[PDB]
Amino acid sequence: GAGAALRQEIEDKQLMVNNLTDELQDAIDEANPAEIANTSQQLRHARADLADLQRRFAVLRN
Amino acid sequence: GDLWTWRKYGQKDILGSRFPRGYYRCAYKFTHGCKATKQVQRSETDSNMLAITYLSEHNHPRPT
Ligand SMILES: [Zn+2]
């Protein structure tokens, strides 16, 4: 498929979202409110990026 | 050193550093199904130090 790079980009982003989630949960286990704030904030941005790339894919399906 | 080919998939702003951590996955992640990743951290203070975390071995030899 032509837009197969969109499939790649998506998984790369989903991977970063997974790291940031791992760290956020690690930070919750460690009870590090400063690192909770830092990671949770950057996880919103990463997840929105992911959301945007998925919208683009749904477009091609149509 | 590092003899592999990587593609940066993200970075995180670390606390108490203007140097963000780089998140890298194998260039062959998609072509060969490679799982391998590494995290790279430089220190603004300690000039020559470089901290890398490798997760997972590669499912291929290193290329030319
Ligand atoms: Zn590899």
Residue numbers in the entry:
A (entry chain A): 153 to 214
B (entry chain B): 1210 to 1273
Q: What is the paper's account of this structure, in its own sentences?
A:
The Arabidopsis immune receptors RRS1 and RPS4 detect the Pseudomonas syringae pv. pisi secreted effector AvrRps4 via a WRKY ID in RRS1. The RRS1WRKY domain may mimic the DNA-binding domain of WRKY transcription factors (TFs), the putative virulence targets of AvrRps4 and PopP2, to enable immune perception of these effectors. AvrRps4 is proteolytically processed in planta to produce a 133–amino acid N-terminal fragment (AvrRps4N) and an 88–amino acid C-terminal fragment (AvrRps4C).
To reveal the molecular basis of the AvrRps4C and RRS1WRKY interaction, we coexpressed the proteins in E. coli, purified the complex, and obtained crystals that diffracted with 2.65-Å resolution at the Diamond Light Source. The interaction between the β2-segment of RRS1WRKY, which harbors the WRKYGQK motif, and AvrRps4C includes hydrogen bonds and/or salt-bridge interactions involving Tyr1218 and Lys1221 of RRS1WRKY and AvrRps4 Glu175, Glu187, and Asn171. Notably, the side chain of RRS1WRKY Lys1221 protrudes into an acidic cleft on the surface of AvrRps4C to contact the side chains of both AvrRps4 Glu175 and Glu187. We found that mutating AvrRps4 residues Asp164 (D164A), Glu175 (E175A), Glu187 (E187A), and double mutant Glu175/Glu187 (EE/AA) essentially abolished complex formation in vitro. The structure of the AvrRps4C–RRS1WRKY complex reveals that the effector directly interacts with the DNA-binding WRKYGQK motif, likely rendering it unavailable for binding to DNA.
